[PDB]
Amino acid sequence: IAAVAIPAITSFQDNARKSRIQSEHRELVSAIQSYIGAQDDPTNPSEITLAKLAPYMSKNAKNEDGIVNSLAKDKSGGSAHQIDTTNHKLISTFTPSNGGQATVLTYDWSANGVNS
Amino acid sequence: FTLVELIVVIIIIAIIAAVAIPAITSFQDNARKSRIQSEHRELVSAIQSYIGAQDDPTNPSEITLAKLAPYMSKNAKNEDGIVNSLAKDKSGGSAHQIDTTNHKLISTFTPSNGGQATVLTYDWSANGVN
Amino acid sequence: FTLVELIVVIIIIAIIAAVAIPAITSFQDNARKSRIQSEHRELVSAIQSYIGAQDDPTNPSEITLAKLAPYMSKNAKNEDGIVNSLAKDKSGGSAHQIDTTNHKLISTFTPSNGGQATVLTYDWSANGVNS
Amino acid sequence: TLVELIVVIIIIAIIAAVAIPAITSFQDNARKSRIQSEHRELVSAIQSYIGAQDDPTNPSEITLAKLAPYMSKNAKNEDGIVNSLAKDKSGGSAHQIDTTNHKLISTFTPSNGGQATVLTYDWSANGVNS
Amino acid sequence: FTLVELIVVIIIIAIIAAVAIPAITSFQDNARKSRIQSEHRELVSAIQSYIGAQDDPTNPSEITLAKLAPYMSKNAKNEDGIVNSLAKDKSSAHQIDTTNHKLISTFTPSNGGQATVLTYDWSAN
Amino acid sequence: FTLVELIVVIIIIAIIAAVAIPAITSFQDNARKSRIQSEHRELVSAIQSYIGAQDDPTNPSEITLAKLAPYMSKNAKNEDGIVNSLAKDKSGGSAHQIDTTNHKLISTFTPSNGGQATVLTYDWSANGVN
Amino acid sequence: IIIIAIIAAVAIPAITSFQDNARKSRIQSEHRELVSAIQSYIGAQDDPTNPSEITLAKLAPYMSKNAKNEDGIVNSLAKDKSGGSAHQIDTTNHKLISTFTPSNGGQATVLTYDWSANGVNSN
Amino acid sequence: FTLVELIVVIIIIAIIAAVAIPAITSFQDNARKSRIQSEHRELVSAIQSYIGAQDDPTNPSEITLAKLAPYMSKNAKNEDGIVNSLAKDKSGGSAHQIDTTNHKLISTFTPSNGGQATVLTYDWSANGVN
Amino acid sequence: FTLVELIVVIIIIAIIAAVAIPAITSFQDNARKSRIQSEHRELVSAIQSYIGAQTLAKLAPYMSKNAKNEDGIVNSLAKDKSGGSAHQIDTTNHKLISTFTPSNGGQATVLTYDWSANGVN
């Protein structure tokens, strides 16, 4: 009875965090769509940046004062989301604790498309 | 054996609930701007038809959007006349205006956030030259 | 995805559907009146040429637009009656008539709203000239 | 291990008691949005058809069977528009023509039995002066 | 559709509605310029015909459009004053000088450009 | 959780997304029908100006539209043959045809749904009147 | 220790039975976007009334890369797990077909769209 | 809530998030294409009128759009130069340009993805067909 | 409106703008043709009258001056496209010639008259 194995918590923890990042990314990808839809000339995208995308997203459950307190946090192998403002790309990263290979999501609105 | 399972549940329930929530009404406003800009060209088409149906198109008479009335299909329900149908813009009583004395049609729109106004003009005589 | 976005979809549709819609009917009367006047000039040219073809141009016999038939091509649908080529007066059907006993051609138009009518006159008798 | 085995029962008893939500939500009021756009669709079709015969001022008597070849088949490859326009109470199309009055009526009625809604279009009469 | 189609349908309108508007009355007045010339030709033929009326075609008398009126028909309105059946301009668009046997037609456009002149003489050349 | 997936994942998306689709073909017919007529009238004006140039306007030797070619300007993209400029209908490839035996010019059109045809004719023969 | 044999008796829900209503949804909502793409493309070329030889490899510029940044369109659409796109173009028929089959082997469902000579022609 | 239930909530999200995303820009430039095709036919109407209004229409002089300016109205912002009204393209920035010596009007359109260009052309100076 | 609706106007405009248009110059020179063929008979009647009265410079007083008071008939007679009078005389040949050349580079057309040696075989 003493020999029964005990599983580690971190294995279930990390694989849930991997779901959180993957949800928030898919919300930001339509928030930014609304911003480009509503900039004063929507036909010519201009200098999107995360701090100015803020008013489309609700406060955290503590009613704190900025979305860096709401969007998720990661090692980024610290904000789990970043904008490459001059290159017009959004990137979201999940880094495992165990040394497994990292997962990076991406979105890209500057006329690149699939080109294939 | 089960207690580890239960505390695992208690952790994951905590961390998946933190997901951020979008804000309602955020994009809603600029549809009205789209209505204004699409309805302006429709009034330009109407006024440019009336200007051709009068007897002396070389020397046109006055216009007001009351005389312009019989072109706008009565607003999808029992309603009296076109002022009931053209977009409202209470913050800036009718979105459409005619300077009946100086032959100028103007449409205007203004966000609530204090950004600068949108204005559109059409001016149907002796204009266009540099 | 989540509820809020799918609510704003409904709101945007409810707004965008409320653009006004233009009427079907406009500007028809001047189009009819223009064909009337241009066709009138063509009938005046036809009858003026016909007077030169009788055995004595100074004293022609009776003229009727049924006699004037061989000057006008068939209708574009290949129907052959001259009256099926000329415009219709929708007050009631040719908008053109000949006062055969008094040498006068008359082309009439009546506005669709019932306003004031307009008439064009021509005659080939000597009474067509004055000092 | 009897201590943890004891408290496992307590944790189960607590976790099982959570409030369980119910299914309905917007599934009613979303259908009204199908109606609002499918109406403007039929108005665009009928406003094309009314101009195709040789006299746009004396059109023939429209029935939606004559309008039908403007609509695509249902995605399930059904064979007629009544299997495509939104259904309503038996009375089953929410849209009908009553050609003797020259009007198209589109309808809605909520499950709570509240105030019903009507959208009307008319190709005979339109807004009066003033 | 989902939201993206509804932002595309807003983006598209802003660049359909911008198509430029052509003016009105840009080309109106040159129809007067043309019908002035055709009426000039017809009046020239009429005054030429007039020389055959009196007993001696080698010694014709004075002429005015009042004398010449018997040679062309009443108005399409069936009114009969030829001073309104001729073309009209800032001035009758046509003139006769009994003292020089000269017939003149003239047209001046509203844009302030150069005036245009036509002339005929049945007496000497 | 599961049910607030369920509703948006199935119910509301199924209700909102499956509105009826307009048919992309049937709206084209009036545009084709119009451009046919406009080209017909301009071809008549051209041939009616070709006859008046001949050395013997009582007997123009023959007319086929290759001879008529230089009276209309070359199309956009500069595909400089006349047949490249006129309307097409493989079921009529020109939609206009010249009969050299009967001196007759013909135009023809047919709606894609298999409706009744329309035909136009012009004829400069002595058989072409009354 | 006997109590553990009772505590262990709880039945396990089978994950496969919860998938169908999700895949069905991301077939329907994807089909409607491919149709909107086709219905735009058919108006872009120089002859609005004679189609080109449409195939989805030429629709490709109308929708984004995968989140994995793999390019090409076929990597992006939903997969028929029986075998690989769940969306097919039958070029000869001008017909688009989309297919779904439940894992337990129930009756199939197909969506369809067709952009030539395809008015209903009621009764 | 039990773990074997709680993980399917993860699975459903992992499926439903992975829809395709439509690319805005490829829909946008299909509209800019239809500006070019409309504005070109307006410039043809203007230049074909101006050749008719000159002092001797058989002997037209050089043309520039600056000379052509008064024939179409100034833009909705009451900006006062023709060049601001006409559409813009990277092949410029005006998409429309006139060859003063070869008497040719050229409109060019460049796809945003760097694909194959498209050009429209008109030529009033006696070039004709065949 | 929605895209399914909105793109059909793009279709319709793309169709309506394709209508062909007539060539201006191909009427205009076939008009000029008529003043050549007609004024040829005016010159013939004048010079035939002159040879009964007992180069076009000698003929000049026999015909009316232009409506804009040009200085002589050489400015009233029509203009040759080739290279300027479209009419010429040669008193070494007793011959009058008139010519028209089309703008397309197609077949040129020539009239002739002589006050001697009419008639054949």
Author numbering:
A (entry chain E): 16 to 92, 100 to 138
B (entry chain I), F (entry chain A), H (entry chain B): 1 to 92, 100 to 137
C (entry chain C): 1 to 92, 100 to 138
D (entry chain H): 2 to 92, 100 to 138
E (entry chain F): 1 to 91, 101 to 134
G (entry chain D): 10 to 92, 100 to 139
I (entry chain G): 1 to 54, 64 to 92, 100 to 137
Tell me, in the authors' exact words, what the paper reports.
Type 4 pili (T4P) are important virulence factors, which belong to a superfamily of nanomachines ubiquitous in prokaryotes, called type 4 filaments (T4F). T4F are defined as helical polymers of type 4 pilins. S. sanguinis T4P have been characterised in depth, revealing that they are heteropolymers of two major pilins (PilE1, PilE2)—which is unusual—and three minor pilins (PilA, PilB, PilC). Our 3.7 Å resolution cryo-EM structure of S. sanguinis heteropolymeric T4P and the resulting full atomic model including all minor pilins highlight universal features of bacterial T4F and have widespread implications in understanding T4F biology.
After 3D refinement and local refinement on the central portion along the filament axis (150 Å long), we generated a final density map at 3.7 Å resolution, as estimated by gold-standard Fourier shell correlation (FSC). The resolution, which is close to 3.3 Å in the central portion of the filament, decreases to 4.3 Å towards the edges, especially towards both ends. This made it impossible to precisely calculate the helical symmetry operators for the filament, which could nevertheless be estimated at 11 Å in rise and 93° in twist angle. As PilE1 and PilE2, which could not be distinguished within the final density map, share high sequence identity, we arbitrarily chose PilE1 to produce an atomic model of S. sanguinis T4P. In our atomic model, the pilin subunits display a canonical lollipop structure in which the α1N portion of a 52 residues-long α1 helix protrudes from a globular head. In the globular head, α1C is packed against a three-strand β-sheet, which is flanked at its N- and C-termini by two regions with limited secondary structure elements, a large αβ-loop and a short CT tail, respectively. Critically, as in other structures of bacterial T4F11, a portion of α1N is melted, the extent of which varies slightly between Ile16 and Gln28 in the different chains. The superposition of the structures of the complete pilins that we were able to resolve, shows that the α1N up to the end of the melted region are intrinsically flexible, emanating at different angles from the globular heads, which in contrast remain almost unchanged, aligning with 1.3 Å root-mean-square deviation (RMSD) globally. The filaments are right-handed with four pilins per turn, displaying approx. 11 Å rise and 93° twist between consecutive subunits within the 1-start helix. Perhaps the most unusual interaction is within the right-handed 1-start helix, where the CT tail in PilE1 (mostly negatively charged) engages the next pilin αβ-loop (mostly positively charged) through electrostatic interactions. At the level of the left-handed 3-start, the melted region in subunit S is held in a groove between α1N of subunit S+3, and α1C of subunit S−3.
